[PDB]
Each structure stands twice: as structure tokens, then as C-alpha cells.
Design a protein around this ligand. Structure first.
Ligand SMILES: [Mg+2]
Ligand SMILES: [Zn+2]
Ligand SMILES: [Zn+2]
Lengths: 251, 112, 50, 63, 91, 14, 77
RNA sequence: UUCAAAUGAGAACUUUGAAGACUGAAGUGGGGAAAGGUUCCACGUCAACAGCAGUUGGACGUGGGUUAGUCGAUCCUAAGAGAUGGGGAAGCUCCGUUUCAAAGGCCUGAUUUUAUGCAGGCCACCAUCGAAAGGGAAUCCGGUUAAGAUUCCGGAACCUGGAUAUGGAUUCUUCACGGUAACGUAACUGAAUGUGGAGACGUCGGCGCGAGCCCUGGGAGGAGUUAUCUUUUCUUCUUAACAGCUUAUCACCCCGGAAUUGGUUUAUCCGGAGAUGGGGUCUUAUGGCUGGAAGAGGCCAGCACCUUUGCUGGCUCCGGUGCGCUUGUGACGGCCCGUGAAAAUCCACAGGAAGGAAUAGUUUUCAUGCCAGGUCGUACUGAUAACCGCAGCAGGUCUCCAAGGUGAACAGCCUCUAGUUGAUAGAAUAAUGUAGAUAAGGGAAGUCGGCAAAAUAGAUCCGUAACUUCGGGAUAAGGAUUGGCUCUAAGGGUCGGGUACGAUCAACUUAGAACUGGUACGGACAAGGGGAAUCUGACUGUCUAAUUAAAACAUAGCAUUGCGAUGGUCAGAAAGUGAUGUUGACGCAAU
RNA sequence: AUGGUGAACUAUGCCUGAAUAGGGUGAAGCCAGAGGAAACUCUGGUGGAGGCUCGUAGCGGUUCUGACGUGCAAAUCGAUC
């Protein structure tokens, strides 16, 4: 046969990301001394749009504590964050929105975003528009914090890890239909070439497992083992169940 | 109804290659290559064009005197007068409030 | 092209100087077999490919 | 020039000499713009003269 | 005059794309092309620049918010929860 | 070099 | 390239030692429909610029000419 | 296409002239990009080539010809490419481009064996390549050649780099004064470091302003027509870069304190976070006056000569109009799950190191003055003959300027400027053809099938169904009018009033009425056939270049699936390797 | 099978630029006016939206199964679209 489209997406020739208009990697401030012995103050100088990102970015400016310099960090903005707003990053910082407390230093039920899963990741979990992490509980013994992620997953991470308080902005974005192939074209014009998607069942069998036939049809099942190899994994990889979700998720 | 030519070798209607049609002492129409328009300097705080400053391209700002490029105020060619006023006020006031915050905790712990 | 490189121009100049018939006194030489210039090139007939 | 002189006098403008629409020949937006410019010019002159007070000028502007 | 019974801003989409989708888009297009009340200057000037960015024409402030509304309900809830937890813990 | 297209007839052949 | 409008600056300028040449151009002009008159322009060639003085009174112009030095090469026209 | 003449051995084809035509400014014009490469131009010349000819030529032979501090490359970065360190690989070599590297150079000096070490201090980016359409230091007019020109001549400017003196400014209150302010000026110290701006930015819509063009009145000149008429038809009446004074929407300052709410745009926004109003500040896009600069260039007249050839005079003025065309620009508005490059480079600011005067000093962002500006490109074509298609092929091949009339219109049709008048000709006019047309009566009976053709067509007025996602259907269907001439009515701008009008100027838009004519009149060009229903795909969109444009593909929408990073999907021979990922479940991947 | 050359056609993505008459319909928002045993609607304008529409340049390539089919052309020509 022929190498299929999913196999061709790893070379990264035309399937890379379109990253020119992007302002930068939206990383939290490096965890130096202040953020683990006190707090440091920064100021939000502008909220801006980032191409390929439904959540806006906040250009927070902090000072370098060691050199007369004005290092500027790029935060994902949170719903309620505004220009002229002071952001306080550190351990001994107040529980207000926009601030970058550690998770040990917040109570249960607190709502946080851009959470480091390991201290010094400078941003992981809860980064997209409208999404937040919940703190369920703590374990001050073997210092650990249980959290609820946007997926429903309960995860245990370090209480020295950080997180921005509040909700990531840009929510409701997917509640609007696009109505237009053009709108979707322009959606993916600034992320990566993933669009349009032709169906394997409408291909020839040189090009896909689902291809071929005098009728359009898969023939064999579309549930594919995880022990399948590159070139077979077209369909529903390691599907525990399949069909319409008639009920709760049994979790 | 005389018709003109690009007087250089770039044939395309690019931003670098705008022309104005001008009538010469010969009586003919000729094309005249105009340079791109100069954008005013802005204040770093507000973002608004700030008056008293000459409008030029960046390398032409090295031909002229200081006074085409500065007003006699502190933060002359860089910040608007109103931005300056605001930060003067902010400076003086919150310095005074820092003094007040200091003496407050001073007399507090002195009481305890 | 008109906006051209020196190297291209140089190779053209060589071709120009080469675009000549024989000097007709070579035909008179002893043990001569050259009747004409067989490497003769013209802009319409054959291109240089430079 | 002769044809233009005749056109000025109203000739050669009937329904059979019109291959384009009324809004193509003269747009409604252009007519409205001329009209409002006229009315606002007048009301402003009348204010500046004192033949009208601001309280009437306003209602007549919006009317 | 009134020119449309029920399509409003979604008359530009004509007959296309279906009534239910045009409804959904109406309910959000109104929201995002609306003006909102500035909390800082007190004026009805706040207009969206892009998804999640709401700017006040006067006061020249900029706020992060919803894609089509300034405040999501889910975030106002977060703000109230946070006020409560904050003034619950030292109090 | 030439593969002309008119000799191709499958009408009445099969 | 430049005008000068006071004769004293012009005389100071004629003795600058980079100045070598000058020319004296006569024109005929019309102040109004009742009077044509004889305008004159004194042009001095500096190393970088040309300085011009416009005189409409021939009485002042014929004095200004003799006010020149001999070192300056003049071109009447 | 035609006639004549000249040339010539010889002329349907060369040259000139005369005439008739075409391209018709979305050109057969004038220039360029790529490509070509001397095809440019002259002289000589016709054996081959120019599918006939040939005295001609992009042919043949011999020669000439491309002049730059300012146009460009050069420089910067883009997507990306790619050494080094290191790591893989038997290896050719692969990965990766700041990486697990001890990765470098900049100011002031300090000495006066002396040349440059030590004295300090600063600084951490971490090669390089990558755009003749991006960014970018600076030049314009006139003239000139057989052939070159923003490059040469003449004149008039500007930028950079470096030298440097004078004048001015400033200082004994050492590093300026004025203004309530916005801010202003000829200048009017300012190191390290740091901030900020410019560079630097979508698309559409309309509104305003400008430029050139178009149109047009008067006048100064020239040509044309002139049986008759025509104060007439055509044409010239121009002013560069640069410099100085002035000139603006926006924005800003001061006085002052707003409901009886006002100001205000075509567009509805603004105001106690201080409106309107009165007075001022600013950007100088842009325009005006002046210089440049009339001496140039254009139109003319007169006197001259084998001649090189001129010489001499005049005039080159004053206005007006606009939904006008093109273009530039400004202030605004709409759109977005799309918010529409970077870097070189330049400037300003903060700061206050260091250095500085009084019998004399510091300052060269003020003026003037001195020197230099290298390398390569630069001709011509740019296409029914200079490129690619085997070729002088009806094919293909990026872009700029863009007159008048008709008319909605860079539609079609005619014309001016400019350019061609090329494509084998002659004689006859049979069939059959190709292209184009017409047809009595009928009217799809033709045919697989109304294929093809006809019919319809513009604008104005009237009228307009089923159905419907209420948005549409819809120009539904279907009807009437349209010329010319003479009139009428309405619709405007600017000036005019102690503390109701008048004068003047200038537009094409609509509507109506008489009259008229072989009842014609969107008179050529141009320009929809419609209706009732069904299968089918929702739509727009896409593909089988060279037999299938479709019901196929895509699409929005729906649903499912996997993954919480020590991860999912995918890549790689391996790798201290990679894409997703400048990512993080409103995400990515798979269906 | 081994080792090499090709994206000057074409496919797709990225960067940087350029290009695209005149008309029709007439969406939001806005103005005025009328109406309202209270409530909010109706009319006339403005405005100038839309992967709308007629239709140029342009891009394509439906039909004539037209011309040509030892062509002008190893895919062109003309009308119609
Ligand atoms: Mg009652
Ligand atoms: Zn400011
Ligand atoms: Zn505000």
C-alpha cells in the first residue's frame, strides 16, 4: 500500500504549526526565590489576542530582583484580569484573581488555572479557554494536593506547584456554530494544516484501511487495538466502548 | 492625456514604489517616486501622537536639531504631558502614604 | 536579464568573441583540413544554457 | 457641445435614453447627503444669526 | 421601521445554514456586538476587540472576559467563591 | 513518441 | 536656493572667500496694469548654496552693483 | 488594400509621398520583471533562411555601443537552510542551531625605556546564509547620441563618513531663556545602564481633502474650413527635486461651569472623568507666495545663407466647475473561534559618571566652510518574430500609465495621441463544405432527447402565487411606456441686517404637458425564455491537466474514540534525535 | 535489484508581495412620526451587511458531442457557458 495521512503527520513537513503571529510561549514566571519565600509584584500592561489560541494573553511585567531590568512575562489572561492590574506571584501572596499562589497555599474549592504539574513546568494543566482546575483536598503529610482536571480526572501533584487563580478567559467560544467552511478554514489557517479531512472510506485501499469497495464501507471493525502498529491505527484506538453514550460515565 | 512610466526597474505597485504624477518645465507629465509617509511618535503610556515632535522616518531624525524632536518638559519626546502629570501626582502621593504606613506600624508596635 | 551577474556577463562576452567565422588565411596553411567553424553559435539556433 | 447644450435644456433624457437605473445615474445616498447638508447649513446659519434658539435648533436637527 | 420579524442580525446569512443555527448565532452575535457597562469609568462603552478581549473606548482599559460576553456566569461564581474563601480564612 | 487517442475504441470491441 | 532680503547680509556674504561668482539677472514685470518695471536679481554662488536677492528699485540696484568688490566675478544678463 | 515616383538587372511585398483602413488607452501604444544574450545601431550586402518573392530583415559579413556617492544589488531579517560544540553512524555522512562548551570585545585611559602591556570598569548576546516585489541614508530639471542616460554636459540639491577653523550661542547664579498652559526657539554639556517610539503593516464600505487628468469661459499667437453659415473647429499658453514664510482634520491647553439637556456626523456618538461657547498650542500629509526660474522649455514673427548655419525680437496671462476618472491620504464605521511579519537601523527619554569659566573658558545635534564616496549591473525584446513550446507555432507567460463620445459602465460601437497597414498573390464564382444569415403556411409532427437556432432581453410604472428555515421564492408569472422638438414645475451655493426680502453665481436629476412622424422610438451595439412537477446532493466551494464536473470529494452540524505529559498519535538506521507543541481536554490525535 | 537526479509542470503547506468595472437586493445599528384601561407595536427614512445576486477584467472549461483532427496546436479554435 501507501503511507497514510496519519503516518505523514510526524515528519512535520506541511503539518507543522503556523507560529509567526503568536506572541510567545505563555509560561509562568520562573520559580526563583521570591515565589517560594514571599511574593513579587508585576503589572499587566496589555491583554492581547494570540493567533491559534482562543484564550487571550496577558503581558505581565515583573522586575528582575538582581539586575536593573524589567523582564516581561507572558501569561494566559484570566476572566476578570485587566490592564493596570497588579499581579502578585508567590507563596505569601493573597488569594485574589490573577495571582500565582502555590496549591498548598489555597483552600479546597479554590479555582485555579495554568497549573504546573511539577514545580518549574511554568505552565501545564488548565490552559485553554474557559477551563479551570479545582482543588479537592490536601495531604500536608507527604506534601501533595488532589485536584480535579477539566476531564474529570483526579490527579495528585505537589503542593509546591503553582497555579493562577480564576478561570481562563475566552469561554463560550465553542457555543457558537461556525456555519462556514471559510470560518473553519481561517480557524486552522493559523494553527496547522489539519483541515479539510477526507474520509478513508471514500479513498482507495492503497491510501487507507477503510478504502475501497463497490460500496463505501469499512468492512472490518473500526476498533483497533493499542498493540496495533502505525498504518493500522485508523478508527477508534483501544475503544473500551463504542456507540452512543446512554448514561453516566460509570466513574 | 500623456501616460507615464515607472522611472525605476521595479514594475510592481508596492509600498516602496508609490508615484505621483507631476508636470515638468518641459510640459510633459512625468512620474515622481514618493517616499513612504512618516508616522508620528507616540507616548509609551497612552499610545497617542504626542505634539511638538516632527514627523519623519527614523534615519531623518538624525539630520535635525533636538528641538524638532523634544519638548522642554521632563519626559519630552517620550511621554504626553498628561501622563507626566499623572505619574508626578502618583509619585508624590504614594510616597506620602508610604510615610503614613510607616508611622502607623511604628506607633502600633510601640504600643505593643 | 538586464540585472545580471558578472559571471554570466563574462561568459556571454566569451561567447560573443567566439561568434566569428574562420580567418580565411588558415585555409591556406599546409596540411590544413579546417574548412569552416563547426562550433558556430547563433542566438536563434542554439541556446547556451547558462 | 451641441448635444450637451440640448441636454441642459432637457432633451435626450426620456425613458428611451436611459439604459441604467435611477440609483446608477444618481444615487439616493447622494441626494440625501446634499439635502441634509443643506438643512444643517441653514439651521447653523440661523443659530449664528439669532433667528433661532438652540432649543428649536435641536428638534429641527433631529427632525 | 422594523424590517425583520425574527432573524435580526442573521438576515445576512439569508436562507442558508438553517434556522436553529441562525438562532444560536443570533443569541451570541447580539451579545458580542453589544456595548457593555464599564466598571471603572461607569460608561456604556465596552466593546469587544477579539474573543475574550473587551475594551472601553473611554478610560482605555482592557479586560479579559468571555468570547461573546464580558462575564461568564461560571466566572462570576468563581469571583464570589474566591471573595468568600478569602474573607473566610483570616476572618 | 506519440500515443494518439483515436485508435482507442472499446465500443464494439469486446 | 535661498532668498536674502536685507542688503547688509548680502554684502557680508559677498566677502566670504568661498564665494567666487555672481550673476545679475534683469526681468520685466508688472506690479499692476498701469506700470511695468525692471526687476533685478543678484545671485551669489556659495560652495553649497545659491543666495538670491530680489530688488524692484533700479535706483537701489545700480547702487548695490557698485557696492560690490572687484574680486567677485560678475555676470550681467 | 490602392496609385505614382525613386532605387535597382529585376519590384504585389523595399523607401518616400498621396489615399483608404485597423488597434481604439482591459491598445497592434509607452515601460519593465523573469528568461534570452548583442537580437540594439551603422556600413556593406543577398549563396542559404524569412514554408511566394525580396533591392528588405531579429538573416550574412564587418564594426560601434551599456559611464551612477543618490536607481539597484551590496546590508536586515522572513518562512526556512546550515557549520561549530557535542551526540549517533562501519562509513559516504546524520541530528541539532543555543544546545549538558572555560564559546567573546567595547570605552575611557594609564605611560611618556614605548609601544601598547598593565591599571580599572563595561558587557553576554552566543557563526553564517536567506527577498534586484518585503525593511531600507540621500537627485531633480533641461539638453545631448546612429545607438547611452534619474549615470553623460549644464545648472541646481541632498546623504553618509571624516576632518576641521571662523562666526554665533552659552558661562562669574557655570552646563539657555520665554509662555498660566498646551508648548516655542538657530543653538543651549551629558558616560554606564534602563525604558519608550519609529521601522511596523489586514480587508471592505462610504464621507472629506489634495494631485494629475477630463470639461470649460475670456484673452494673446499659429494652422483649418469658408457656394452658404459658423465672435467658429484644432492647437501652445508649462514650471521639477530642494529651501524659506504660511497653511489642518485629529489631538491638546486656559477661562468657564451645562436639564428647558445641548453639540454633532452621510453614517450617533460626545459631555460634571468638565460639553457647547470664547481664546490659543501642535503634527506640515497637503496646498499657496517666494527662491530654484526663465536665462530653460513651448508657440510665433521677421531678417538672413552653397555653407559650419543661425541672428534678432515678441508672447508664454487670467479664471471657473464637479456623486466626473485614476490615484494618494485623513478621520470614522463594519467583519472575524481569522484581529491581519520580523530584524537591521534611527531617535527621544530617565539617570547623573566625568569633565568643565573670568583677564578667561568650555560647547561643533546652530550657520558657513574643507575632503572622499569604492565593486558589479545598466544596450534591446518582453512577445501573432527577440522567453518556453523541435520553428518566424492562432498556444502559454508577472506587472505599471490609460484621452473624447454614446452609455450604468477600463461592456460593446466610432474617433484623437502613439503604432501597424504584417499574415503567398492573381482570375473566375461549379458542386460539396466551413463560418454567417433569411424564409409562405404549419409549429417539435423532427430526434434517444427541442441537440441547434429562434424567441425573451435595458430602463420607468403597475402587478406578482404555491411553498417557506419568514431570510426568500421574485426580474416570479404577467402587462403597459420609451424618439425628436418646444415648453412648464421642483430640487442649490455665496454675500448682504440698530444693540419678511434683495443681489449674485452655477449645476444635472426627476416629473408633467402640448406639437410632430408612413404608430416609428433600449431603432445600430447591447441585452433573462418562462411555468407546473419529480429523482438527487442542503448551500458557496473541489477533482479525474489531455474523453467522465457529477448524484462523487469537501463543508458547517452531529456523534464516537484515545490521551492528564514518565502521556496519546506519528516520524527516524541511530541519536544527549524529532512533528503535534510558541501545545495542554472549549486542546491535540483518530474515525 | 543497486546506487543516484529531479517540485522550472503539477499537488499541498508556509514567508513575502500584487490583482479584482458597473449594477440589484437592501441585514444590524440609528432618526423622526403615529398608536397604546397600563403593556410595545406600526409607518417612513437612514445605513450599507452577505463564503447573496446580475455581470466585466480574471480564473475555469458545460454544450455544440461545432471547427481542426498528416492541426495554428503531441489538447488549440469559435460561439455557448
Ligand atoms: Mg376604564
Ligand atoms: Zn500620553
Ligand atoms: Zn473605561
Amino acid at each position: 500500500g501507501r503511507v497514510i495521512r496519519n503516518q505523514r503527520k510526524g515528519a512535520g513537513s506541511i503539518f507543522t504549526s503556523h507560529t509567526r503571529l503568536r506572541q510567545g510561549a505563555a509560561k509562568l514566571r520562573t520559580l526563583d526565590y521570591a515565589e517560594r519565600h514571599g511574593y513579587i509584584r508585576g503589572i499587566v500592561k496589555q491583554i492581547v489576542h494570540d493567533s491559534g489560541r482562543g484564550a487571550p494573553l496577558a503581558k505581565v511585567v515583573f522586575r528582575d530582583p538582581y539586575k536593573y531590568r524589567l523582564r516581561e512575562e507572558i501569561f494566559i489572561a484570566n476572566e476578570g484580569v485587566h490592564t493596570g492590574q497588579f499581579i502578585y506571584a508567590g507563596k505569601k501572596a493573597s488569594l485574589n484573581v490573577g495571582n500565582v499562589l502555590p496549591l498548598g497555599s489555597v483552600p479546597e474549592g479554590t479555582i485555579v488555572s495554568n497549573v504546573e504539574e511539577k514545580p518549574g513546568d511554568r505552565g501545564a494543566l488548565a490552559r485553554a479557554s474557559g477551563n479551570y482546575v479545582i482543588i479537592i483536598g490536601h495531604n500536608p503529610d507527604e506534601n501533595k494536593t488532589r485536584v480535579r482536571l477539566p476531564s474529570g480526572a483526579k490527579k495528585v501533584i505537589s503542593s509546591d506547584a503553582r497555579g493562577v487563580i480564576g478561570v481562563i478567559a475566552g469561554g463560550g467560544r465553542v457555543d457558537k456554530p461556525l456555519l462556514k467552511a471559510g470560518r473553519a478554514f481561517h480557524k486552522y489557517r493559523l494553527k496547522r494544516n489539519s483541515w479539510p479531512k477526507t474520509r478513508g472510506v471514500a479513498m482507495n485501499p492503497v491510501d487507507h484501511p477503510h478504502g475501497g469497495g463497490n460500496h463505501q464501507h469499512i468492512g472490518k471493525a473500526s476498533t483497533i487495538s493499542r498493540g496495533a502498529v502505525s498504518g493500522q491505527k485508523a478508527g477508534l484506538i483501544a475503544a473500551r466502548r463504542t456507540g452512543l453514550l446512554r448514561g453516566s460515565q460509570k466513574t | 492625456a500623456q501616460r507615464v512610466t515607472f522611472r525605476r526597474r521595479n514594475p510592481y505597485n508596492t509600498r516602496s514604489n508609490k508615484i505621483k504624477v507631476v508636470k515638468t518645465p518641459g510640459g510633459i507629465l512625468r512620474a515622481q517616486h514618493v517616499k513612504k509617509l512618516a508616522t508620528r511618535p507616540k507616548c509609551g503610556d497612552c499610545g497617542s501622537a504626542l505634539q511638538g515632535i516632527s514627523t519623519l522616518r527614523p534615519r531623518q531624525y538624525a539630520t535635525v536639531s533636538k528641538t524638532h524632536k523634544t519638548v522642554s518638559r521632563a519626559y519630552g519626546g517620550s511621554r504626553c504631558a498628561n501622563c507626566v502629570k499623572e505619574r508626578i501626582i502618583r509619585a508624590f502621593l504614594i510616597e506620602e502614604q508610604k510615610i503614613v504606613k510607616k508611622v502607623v506600624k511604628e506607633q502600633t508596635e510601640a504600643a505593643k | 536579464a538586464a540585472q545580471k551577474s558578472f559571471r554570466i556577463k563574462q561568459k556571454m562576452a566569451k561567447a560573443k568573441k567566439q561568434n566569428r567565422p574562420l580567418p580565411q588565411w588558415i585555409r591556406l596553411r599546409t596540411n590544413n583540413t579546417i574548412r569552416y567553424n563547426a562550433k558556430r553559435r547563433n542566438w536563434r539556433r542554439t541556446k547556451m544554457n547558462i | 457641445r451641441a448635444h450637451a447644450q440640448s441636454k441642459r435644456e432637457g432633451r435626450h433624457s426620456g425613458y428611451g435614453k436611459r439604459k441604467g437605473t435611477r440609483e446608477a445615474r444618481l444615487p439616493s445616498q447622494v441626494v440625501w447627503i446634499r439635502r441634509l447638508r443643506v438643512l444643517r447649513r441653514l439651521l447653523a446659519k440661523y443659530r449664528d444669526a439669532g433667528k433661532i434658539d438652540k432649543h428649536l435648533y435641536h428638534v429641527l436637527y433631529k427632525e | 421601521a422594523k424590517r425583520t420579524k425574527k432573524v435580526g442580525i442573521t438576515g445576512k446569512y439569508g436562507v442558508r445554514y438553517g434556522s436553529s443555527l441562525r438562532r444560536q448565532v443570533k443569541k451570541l452575535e447580539i451579545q458580542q456586538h453589544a456595548r457593555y457597562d464599564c466598571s471603572f469609568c461607569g460608561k456604556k462603552t465596552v466593546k469587544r476587540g477579539a474573543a475574550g478581549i473587551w475594551t472601553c473606548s473611554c478610560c482605555k482599559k482592557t479586560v479579559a472576559g468571555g468570547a461573546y460576553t464580558v462575564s461568564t456566569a461560571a466566572a462570576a461564581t468563581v469571583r464570589s467563591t474566591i471573595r468568600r474563601l478569602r474573607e473566610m480564612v483570616e476572618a | 513518441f506519440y500515443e494518439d487517442y483515436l485508435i482507442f475504441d472499446c465500443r464494439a470491441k469486446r | 536656493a535661498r532668498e536674502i532680503t536685507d542688503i547688509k547680509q548680502f554684502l557680508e556674504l559677498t566677502r566670504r572667500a568661498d564665494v567666487k561668482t555672481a550673476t545679475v539677472k534683469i526681468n520685466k514685470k508688472l506690479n499692476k496694469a498701469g506700470k511695468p518695471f525692471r526687476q533685478t536679481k543678484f545671485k551669489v554662488r556659495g560652495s553649497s548654496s545659491l543666495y538670491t536677492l530680489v530688488i524692484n528699485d533700479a535706483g537701489k540696484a545700480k547702487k548695490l552693483i557698485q557696492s560690490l568688490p572687484p574680486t567677485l566675478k560678475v555676470n550681467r544678463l
